[PDB]
């Protein structure tokens, strides 16, 4: 139907905007601490601690399959990256501290993303 096509175009355009958001958030992790899944070879107990692992590569795979239907779903995954790290790692670690800085800097980006998503529809 034509309605299905219009819905698909809206999803495509959201995907475009989320790709720009993802790039901007990933620039706030210049150490690449959050770039890839935590390795279960290197951290074999990880899944005993963290039930829903997340990372920027995993998000990018979902995004490119147009698997984010709205900005809330995308933010949920971003918050998992941060929140997982802040539980597994202690406050005195470069990992925790990177997550704090990514959360604080990403908030600014996400605030305007929400306005754009609402504004453009």
UniProtKB/Swiss-Prot annotation:
Tissue: Highly expressed in testis.
Glycyl lysine isopeptide (Lys-Gly) (interchain with G-Cter in SUMO2) cross-link, chain position(s): 41
Record domain Bromo: where: 9-113
Intracellular or extracellular location(s): Nucleus; Chromosome
Subunit composition and interactions: Component of some HBO1 complex composed of KAT7/HBO1, MEAF6, ING4 and BRD1/BRPF2. Component of the MOZ/MORF complex composed at least of ING5, KAT6A, KAT6B, MEAF6 and one of BRPF1, BRD1/BRPF2 and BRPF3. Interacts (via PHD-type zinc finger domain) with unmodified histone H3. Interacts (via PWWP domain) with dimethylated and trimethylated 'Lys-79' on histone H3.
Purpose: Scaffold subunit of various histone acetyltransferase (HAT) complexes, such as the MOZ/MORF and HBO1 complexes, that acts as a regulator of hematopoiesis. Plays a key role in HBO1 complex by directing KAT7/HBO1 specificity towards histone H3 'Lys-14' acetylation (H3K14ac), thereby promoting erythroid differentiation.
This protein's name: Bromodomain-containing protein 1
Encoding gene, per UniProt annotation: BRD1
